[PDB]
Amino acid sequence: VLSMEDKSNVKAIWGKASGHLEEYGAEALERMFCAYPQTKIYFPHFDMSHNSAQIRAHGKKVFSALHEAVNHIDDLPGALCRLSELHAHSLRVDPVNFKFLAHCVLVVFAIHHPSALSPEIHASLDKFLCAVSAVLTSKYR
Amino acid sequence: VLSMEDKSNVKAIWGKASGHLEEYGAEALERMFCAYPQTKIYFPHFDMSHNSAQIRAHGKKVFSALHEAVNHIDDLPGALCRLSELHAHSLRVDPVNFKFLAHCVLVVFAIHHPSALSPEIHASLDKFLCAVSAVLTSKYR
Amino acid sequence: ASFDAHERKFIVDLWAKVDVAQCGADALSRMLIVYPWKRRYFEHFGKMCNAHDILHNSKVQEHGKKVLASFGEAVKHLDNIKGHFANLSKLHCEKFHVDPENFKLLGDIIIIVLAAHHPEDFSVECHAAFQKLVRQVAAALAAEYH
Amino acid sequence: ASFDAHERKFIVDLWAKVDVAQCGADALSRMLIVYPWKRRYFEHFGKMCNAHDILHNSKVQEHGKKVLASFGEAVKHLDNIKGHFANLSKLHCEKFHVDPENFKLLGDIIIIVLAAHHPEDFSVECHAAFQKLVRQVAAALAAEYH
Ligand code: HEM
Ligand code: HEM
Ligand code: HEM
Ligand code: HEM
């Protein structure tokens, strides 16, 4: 799936996200909610205002989960099982929404780290997010 | 993936396709070409007229491949490897098109065998076609 | 894209032969048997633990009649599908919280139910006109998710 | 859906700051590096065996300028996107045989290229107006696959 070059590319770009997991996580959810407003059907309980305490707290959680997946990039199915059952069975979130978030995550990196997210690193990070998305989708069908 | 009830449901509906692999295969390609005309980009060499010799010959091939997959329903990844590399690398056919064909295959069964394709059998046959589609897609990414 | 006169004649002439009460109950039962998780949106209809329950549940049967009756109003508004379904889009978003990707899946089931009930009318070209209608109704139902 | 005046001001004001030659070359290079198989459609441009080749290939660079220049004509025709791109839809279908699902992927890359070049303009609300534009241009380019 991911090559050894993809894995080192992904560990490098993600080190720039270190110290900003709440800030970057919060912006990626705000971008998904605005650019793909259909995604708000899953969050009927949230205040959807900018830098809402609930959006900050969820953004920190999603980015922390991605941080753990970068650390366990060799075995994503084993690192993300608990989230896989939550997403694919308890929330039954449709696979297309994962694509919408992975795109908002790539825009946040591009905004904060334009030069770091070179075409080769973009290629590797897209590949990693697709893989993470597939473990959270593997039992939805 | 597929249950033992799904497998026996799938072997039962497919026995009605026996003797009509060219006829049913040809109609399912004609339905895909008409209802999803974007799919004609993959067949620039074909005569697209009704009961065209080239459509008859391709329809027989696709349905024969599905016949072999029903016989080897326990190990679809091993039964369909040769087709998996052809579709996912040589033709690079996008995953959404497989959904369009699986739907045209379900319409052909519904037209010729309305009573046989009961809600439970429909459920099993949809599941089998999704699984076949995923083996032909597994290396496209 | 607007329906040509050929598309319009396929749709209008087949819909006059449809038993909307029967085909709607058939399509909703099939949606809940082919996608068993979607029962989550209909738990207030009661017993749905397996396919026999679903096929004998009367709240499922009646809901299916109304859904297909609503879809059948598209046949009278072929030049205004987006505008006719705007209120019903907003209700699926704000009240029922239904992911708009699911409208295509029910549309595909409706095509199968129609094929089975009208095998001689549902020609390659009739099928293509109906797939264009289900695509437009699905898009119109997804259009007020703001 | 038509662009409101807020959407129209985001799009029109940011596109006046875009270096179309640079951003287009960037987006096509990224499309061929992120999806290496799509080089199949561009083999006549010559050397593309790896990312360094792609970034120094001048036929890739010039093709990128023209593609983004074409996308930039949508900003002058926001009320007529479908009608402006009809000829170019038909050419992608009949001549280049390109699967219409790929128009969304290039549109998503254009958003990333714009975000990187204009970090302070590309606000949450500016991004939402641009995602609506890329969705409509992709749909318009897919519309004459008959
Ligand atoms: C990168 C992809 C994703 C990751 C890593 C991720 C991660 C998480 C995590 C860590 C949680 C919290 C689990 C917990 O608190 O125990 C969660 C909850 C949730 N996620 Fe995701 N998620 C992803 C994609 C999505 C998408 C695309 C959607 C919907 C559009 C979604 C909707 C939800 C919802 C609704 C919850 C429950 C929210 C709540 O009330 O707190 N997730 N996810
Ligand atoms: C159930 C799904 C499918 C099966 C079982 C299937 C099976 C086959 C088989 C058996 C062949 C011939 C391989 C050979 O001759 O050695 C083939 C070729 C081909 N398939 Fe498929 N296929 C499927 C889906 C699709 C879809 C969705 C598309 C495109 C929309 C597609 C496009 C093609 C094309 C372009 C060829 C080469 C055609 C030629 O020139 O003969 N296939 N496939
Ligand atoms: C062809 C597509 C669809 C049409 C035309 C349609 C039409 C309708 C109509 C007419 C109502 C009744 C509104 C009212 O009188 O209050 C309704 C309710 C509802 N629909 Fe749909 N619908 C469609 C697809 C779906 C799908 C795909 C789902 C979920 C998977 C869904 C879930 C619901 C739910 C949960 C309700 C409320 C049921 C109740 O509490 O009585 N709909 N729809
Ligand atoms: C934003 C979306 C797109 C726009 C606006 C666009 C625009 C253009 C334009 C303006 C041309 C030149 C036409 C001419 O003057 O003859 C062209 C050619 C072409 N496009 Fe696109 N295009 C887009 C997406 C794509 C995608 C996604 C692919 C394939 C992955 C693609 C493949 C091609 C090919 C193969 C050619 C012919 C190149 C040549 O032989 O010179 N296009 N496109």
PDB file of N, CA and C in Angstrom, chain B residues 37-38 40-42 44 91-94 96-97 140-141, chain D residues 37 40-41 92-93 97-102 105 145-146:
ATOM      1  N   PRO B  37     -24.194   6.685 -20.604  1.00  0.00           N
ATOM      2  CA  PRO B  37     -23.442   6.800 -21.862  1.00  0.00           C
ATOM      3  C   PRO B  37     -21.976   7.201 -21.683  1.00  0.00           C
ATOM      4  N   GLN B  38     -21.583   7.788 -20.533  1.00  0.00           N
ATOM      5  CA  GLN B  38     -20.180   8.056 -20.213  1.00  0.00           C
ATOM      6  C   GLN B  38     -19.321   6.787 -20.307  1.00  0.00           C
ATOM      7  N   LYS B  40     -19.234   4.621 -22.575  1.00  0.00           N
ATOM      8  CA  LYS B  40     -18.821   4.355 -23.948  1.00  0.00           C
ATOM      9  C   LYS B  40     -17.405   4.836 -24.250  1.00  0.00           C
ATOM     10  N   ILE B  41     -16.790   5.643 -23.369  1.00  0.00           N
ATOM     11  CA  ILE B  41     -15.407   6.081 -23.556  1.00  0.00           C
ATOM     12  C   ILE B  41     -14.433   4.902 -23.532  1.00  0.00           C
ATOM     13  N   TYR B  42     -14.806   3.771 -22.894  1.00  0.00           N
ATOM     14  CA  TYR B  42     -13.954   2.599 -22.796  1.00  0.00           C
ATOM     15  C   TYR B  42     -14.076   1.692 -24.016  1.00  0.00           C
ATOM     16  N   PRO B  44     -14.299   2.511 -27.645  1.00  0.00           N
ATOM     17  CA  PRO B  44     -14.282   3.363 -28.835  1.00  0.00           C
ATOM     18  C   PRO B  44     -14.279   2.557 -30.140  1.00  0.00           C
ATOM     19  N   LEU B  91      -6.605  -1.038 -18.273  1.00  0.00           N
ATOM     20  CA  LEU B  91      -7.713  -0.245 -18.799  1.00  0.00           C
ATOM     21  C   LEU B  91      -7.928   0.944 -17.861  1.00  0.00           C
ATOM     22  N   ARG B  92      -7.487   0.775 -16.618  1.00  0.00           N
ATOM     23  CA  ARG B  92      -7.643   1.784 -15.586  1.00  0.00           C
ATOM     24  C   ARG B  92      -9.086   2.289 -15.631  1.00  0.00           C
ATOM     25  N   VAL B  93     -10.046   1.383 -15.421  1.00  0.00           N
ATOM     26  CA  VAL B  93     -11.462   1.720 -15.415  1.00  0.00           C
ATOM     27  C   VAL B  93     -11.821   2.217 -14.009  1.00  0.00           C
ATOM     28  N   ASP B  94     -12.410   3.413 -13.930  1.00  0.00           N
ATOM     29  CA  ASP B  94     -12.740   4.047 -12.663  1.00  0.00           C
ATOM     30  C   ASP B  94     -13.791   3.254 -11.868  1.00  0.00           C
ATOM     31  N   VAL B  96     -16.477   3.858 -10.182  1.00  0.00           N
ATOM     32  CA  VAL B  96     -17.906   4.163 -10.237  1.00  0.00           C
ATOM     33  C   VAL B  96     -18.586   3.385 -11.376  1.00  0.00           C
ATOM     34  N   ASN B  97     -17.837   3.006 -12.424  1.00  0.00           N
ATOM     35  CA  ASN B  97     -18.442   2.352 -13.562  1.00  0.00           C
ATOM     36  C   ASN B  97     -18.910   0.934 -13.202  1.00  0.00           C
ATOM     37  N   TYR B 140      -6.508  -0.455  -8.283  1.00  0.00           N
ATOM     38  CA  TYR B 140      -6.726   0.670  -9.189  1.00  0.00           C
ATOM     39  C   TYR B 140      -6.078   1.942  -8.639  1.00  0.00           C
ATOM     40  N   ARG B 141      -6.200   2.120  -7.312  1.00  0.00           N
ATOM     41  CA  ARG B 141      -5.747   3.288  -6.556  1.00  0.00           C
ATOM     42  C   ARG B 141      -4.301   3.706  -6.887  1.00  0.00           C
TER      43      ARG B 141
ATOM     44  N   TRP D  37      -1.023   7.291 -12.985  1.00  0.00           N
ATOM     45  CA  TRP D  37      -1.579   6.568 -14.116  1.00  0.00           C
ATOM     46  C   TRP D  37      -2.122   7.501 -15.201  1.00  0.00           C
ATOM     47  N   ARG D  40      -1.147   8.460 -18.947  1.00  0.00           N
ATOM     48  CA  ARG D  40      -1.594   7.746 -20.132  1.00  0.00           C
ATOM     49  C   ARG D  40      -2.219   8.707 -21.125  1.00  0.00           C
ATOM     50  N   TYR D  41      -2.951   9.714 -20.616  1.00  0.00           N
ATOM     51  CA  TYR D  41      -3.632  10.682 -21.462  1.00  0.00           C
ATOM     52  C   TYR D  41      -2.680  11.735 -22.030  1.00  0.00           C
ATOM     53  N   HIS D  92     -13.618  16.312 -24.694  1.00  0.00           N
ATOM     54  CA  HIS D  92     -13.086  15.421 -23.684  1.00  0.00           C
ATOM     55  C   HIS D  92     -13.719  14.042 -23.811  1.00  0.00           C
ATOM     56  N   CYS D  93     -14.966  13.978 -24.302  1.00  0.00           N
ATOM     57  CA  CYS D  93     -15.692  12.723 -24.510  1.00  0.00           C
ATOM     58  C   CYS D  93     -15.277  12.021 -25.822  1.00  0.00           C
ATOM     59  N   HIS D  97     -11.398  10.897 -24.764  1.00  0.00           N
ATOM     60  CA  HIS D  97     -11.982   9.728 -24.106  1.00  0.00           C
ATOM     61  C   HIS D  97     -11.671   9.681 -22.610  1.00  0.00           C
ATOM     62  N   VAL D  98     -11.907  10.794 -21.900  1.00  0.00           N
ATOM     63  CA  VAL D  98     -11.507  10.971 -20.511  1.00  0.00           C
ATOM     64  C   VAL D  98     -12.724  10.688 -19.629  1.00  0.00           C
ATOM     65  N   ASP D  99     -12.547   9.878 -18.581  1.00  0.00           N
ATOM     66  CA  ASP D  99     -13.656   9.494 -17.723  1.00  0.00           C
ATOM     67  C   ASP D  99     -14.086  10.735 -16.950  1.00  0.00           C
ATOM     68  N   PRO D 100     -15.383  11.097 -16.959  1.00  0.00           N
ATOM     69  CA  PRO D 100     -15.813  12.373 -16.390  1.00  0.00           C
ATOM     70  C   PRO D 100     -15.682  12.473 -14.877  1.00  0.00           C
ATOM     71  N   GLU D 101     -15.417  11.357 -14.189  1.00  0.00           N
ATOM     72  CA  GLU D 101     -15.083  11.370 -12.768  1.00  0.00           C
ATOM     73  C   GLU D 101     -13.761  12.081 -12.449  1.00  0.00           C
ATOM     74  N   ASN D 102     -12.887  12.249 -13.427  1.00  0.00           N
ATOM     75  CA  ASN D 102     -11.579  12.824 -13.214  1.00  0.00           C
ATOM     76  C   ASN D 102     -11.663  14.357 -13.111  1.00  0.00           C
ATOM     77  N   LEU D 105     -11.404  15.471  -9.418  1.00  0.00           N
ATOM     78  CA  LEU D 105     -10.057  15.329  -8.891  1.00  0.00           C
ATOM     79  C   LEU D 105      -9.150  16.492  -9.303  1.00  0.00           C
ATOM     80  N   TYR D 145     -21.480  14.038 -22.415  1.00  0.00           N
ATOM     81  CA  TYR D 145     -21.089  12.650 -22.620  1.00  0.00           C
ATOM     82  C   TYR D 145     -22.350  11.872 -22.987  1.00  0.00           C
ATOM     83  N   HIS D 146     -22.769  12.001 -24.250  1.00  0.00           N
ATOM     84  CA  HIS D 146     -23.952  11.330 -24.773  1.00  0.00           C
ATOM     85  C   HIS D 146     -23.557  10.017 -25.475  1.00  0.00           C
TER      86      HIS D 146
END
